[PDB]
Amino acid sequence: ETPVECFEPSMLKKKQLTVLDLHPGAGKTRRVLPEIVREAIKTRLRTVILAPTRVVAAEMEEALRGLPVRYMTTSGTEIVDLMCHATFTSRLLQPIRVPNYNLYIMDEAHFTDPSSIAARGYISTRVEMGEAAAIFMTATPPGTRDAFPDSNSPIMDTEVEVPERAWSSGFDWVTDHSGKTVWFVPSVRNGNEIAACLTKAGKRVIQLSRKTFETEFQKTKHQEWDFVVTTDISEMGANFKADRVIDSRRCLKPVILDGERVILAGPMPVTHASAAQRRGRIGRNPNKPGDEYLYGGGCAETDEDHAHWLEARMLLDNIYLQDGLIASLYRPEADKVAAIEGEFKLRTEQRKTFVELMKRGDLPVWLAYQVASAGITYTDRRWCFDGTTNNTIMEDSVPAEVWTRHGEKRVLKPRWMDARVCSDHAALKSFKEFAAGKRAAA
Ligand SMILES: Nc1ncnc2c1ncn2[C@@H]1O[C@H](COP(=O)(O)OP(=O)(O)O)[C@@H](O)[C@H]1O
Ligand SMILES: [Cl-]
Ligand SMILES: [Mn+2]
Numbered sequence: 088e089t090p091v092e093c094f095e096p097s098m099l100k101k102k103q104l105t106v107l108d109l110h111p112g113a114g115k116t117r118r119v120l121p122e123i124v125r126e127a128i129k130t131r132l133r134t135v136i137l138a139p140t141r142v143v144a145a146e147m148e149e150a151l152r153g154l155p156v157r158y159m160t161t162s163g164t165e166i167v168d169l170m171c172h173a174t175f176t177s178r179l180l181q182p183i184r185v186p187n188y189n190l191y192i193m194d195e196a197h198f199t200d201p202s203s204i205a206a207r208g209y210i211s212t213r214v215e216m217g218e219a220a221a222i223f224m225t226a227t228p229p230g231t232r233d234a235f236p237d238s239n240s241p242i243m244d245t246e247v248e249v250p251e252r253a254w255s256s257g258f259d260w261v262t263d264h265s266g267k268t269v270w271f272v273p274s275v276r277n278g279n280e281i282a283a284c285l286t287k288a289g290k291r292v293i294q295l296s297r298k299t300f301e302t303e304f305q306k307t308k309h310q311e312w313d314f315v316v317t318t319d320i321s322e323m324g325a326n327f328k329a330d331r332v333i334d335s336r337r338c339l340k341p342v343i344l345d346g347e348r349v350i351l352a353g354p355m356p357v358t359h360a361s362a363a364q365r366r367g368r369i370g371r372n373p374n375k376p377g378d379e380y381l382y383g384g385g386c387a388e389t390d391e392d393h394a395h396w397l398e399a400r401m402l403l404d405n406i407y408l409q410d411g412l413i414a415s416l417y418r419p420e421a422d423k424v425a426a427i428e429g430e431f432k433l434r435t436e437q438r439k440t441f442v443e444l445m446k447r448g449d450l451p452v453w454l455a456y457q458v459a460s461a462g463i464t465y466t467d468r469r470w471c472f473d474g475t476t477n478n479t480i481m482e483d484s485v486p487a488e489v490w491t492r493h494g495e496k497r498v499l500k501p502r503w504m505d506a507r508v509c510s511d512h513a514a515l516k517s518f519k520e521f522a523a524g525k526r527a528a529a
């Protein structure tokens with residue numbers, strides 16, 4: 088029920104779920120996790136470690152060599168499995184059943200992407216069934232209201248006006264800084280504009296988003312950069328050698344309007360958990376005082392209409408558990424959806440299409456569900472062009488057009504409209520390729 092600051096072997100017993108909420112930088116990932124894993128191995132548990140990103144998983148794989156840990160990019164009691172949250176949930180969605188782990192360790196358990204929410208629901212359900220123990224590691228568990236947690240070194244916090252768009256004058260304090268800054272933006276499109284403005288000022292800028300994270304994060308490990316401009320993905324265990332965080336304190340919220348379409352609402356205030364994790368990128372060196380957190384507004388808790396929790400239910404309704412059972416959301420997040428258990432369950436063929444649209448089509452969960460539940464097969468792209476006029480997708484104030492693999496040039500006008508497929512150039516490029524029956528190599 089209440090979170091703990093210290094690991095104890097009793098936490099590995101079946102039916103125990105423990106939240107370990109040591110403050111940011113206190114050593115959950117690098118110190119407590121190996122201690123748990125060593126004890127899991129000694130007691131012959133069947134253990135999986137769930138990292139939020141491939142970057143952090145590859146860091147764990149290096150940190151845990153010499154231990155029998157197998158990193159899976161997509162065992163019994165002798166080998167500990169390690170994979171990303173999304174890899175875990177993806178495996179639960181395929182016909183071959185996941186090992187019956189009796190110990191789940193989820194690192195950065197605050198991650199609010201649909202696959203992480205679904206993973207917590209499945210895990211917490213297995214624990215309640217008496218089949219496993221689980222440990223959720225995060226300084227900012229669901230519902231935290233503390234944007235200013237403890238840190239290894241004191242942080243200088245200042246509320247300031249943070250640029251939301253490119254600037255041609257003013258804001259000298261942004262560019263006069265001689266250290267390294269991590270700047271949290273609400274969207275890729277907004278980061279693109281901020282980053283271009285910084286580059287014009289002569290700064291060396293690295294941009295981070297979910298789709299580019301693995302390859303672009305490697306650039307931050309070197310000396311030669313001045314700003315990282317990142318979306319909220321860097322709240323999930325990203326390590327920077329930075330002196331300063333600039334925090335818009337803003338995010339976008341995907342919202343399902345009346346079950347018909349998804350809009351991106353905002354930019355609007357972030358949660359306290361998010362603000363704490365953004366600030367928590369700095370102040371991490373106990374012998375380096377003076378790190379700065381400059382933040383642009385207040386916090387607000389997630390409302391009942393954030394699409395990720397409904398999308399998580401769409402995933403969980405299609406994950407096998409035990410005969411006719413369906414997993415619940417982790418209890419502290421279960422009130423965030425009005426959806427009824429099981430209402431998104433698909434028959435077998437539609438479920439395969441649903442998973443293919445997400446994994447191969449790169450479509451958001453909600454959109455993949457609409458298409459699959461309409462009985463459309465994965466390679467039938469006619470729905471990308473037969474929507475109502477209001478669903479026309481624009482590119483540079485002009486309707487976007489696509490050459491289909493059938494040789495016709497069609498206006499992009501999807502039958503279901505999800506704003507996430509056209510929110511920035513890279514998203515639209517991907518969706519235009521999907522609509523044309525093509526796919527970029529991975
Ligand atoms: N590659 C590294 N080498 C040395 N120290 C590191 C490295 N990465 C992180 N640290 C430091 O180790 C400490 C614990 O980090 P971590 O275990 O990631 O904290 P958290 O509790 O947030 O998971 C922090 O002071 C962090 O700055
Ligand atoms: Cl992103
Ligand atoms: Mn401490």
Ligand SMILES: [Mn+2]
Binds near residue numbers: 115117194195324
């Ligand atoms: Mn961590």
